Amino acid sequence: TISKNNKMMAHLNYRMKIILQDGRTFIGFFKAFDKHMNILLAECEEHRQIEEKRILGLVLVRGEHIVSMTVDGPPPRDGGAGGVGQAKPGGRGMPAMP
């Protein structure tokens, strides 16, 4: 997935659920990573087992503490050139017959 460039560029910006070694669950839009497997989560939230949700900001997680992560939700989401022809209204000219 990651590092395979054709694949890695598509796995960024997924909403991913991150599990840390202290047992925390973070959730956020995973949109940068590092060779040390640090990860940067945009619009992050945390879930703590007991479940309770807290809203965080842009959260940088030091890679050393990640256990695992999984996809939670899709990235957010949203030819075109021509004009050669024209299409005035018209009518049907009657041809000849035998």
């Binding site: 000219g93 041809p95 000849a96 017959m97 035998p98």
Partner: protein, 71 residues
């Protein structure tokens, strides 16, 4: 299409009754597959027969020395 009802003149027979627009004829623009139109000249000229240009050709698919067309 439904035809005009009633008799037809005895005054003006087989040349004059036909559909026309210019002084002799119905003239209308046409477009064809140039290459195939070129083929059909060359067959009539060299051979004596051609495949019938008309719309609604009916059974008259070929026009020429029909003995050659069938043979």
């Amino acid at each position: 299409f439904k035809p005009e009802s009633g008799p037809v003149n005895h005054f003006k027979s087989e040349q004059q009754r036909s559909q026309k627009n210019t002084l002799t004829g119905f003239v209308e623009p046409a477009h064809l597959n140039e290459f195939h139109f070129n083929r059909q000249i060359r067959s009539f000229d060299t051979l004596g027969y051609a495949q019938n240009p008309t719309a609604e050709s009916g059974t008259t698919h070929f026009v020429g020395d029909v003995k050659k067309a069938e043979a």
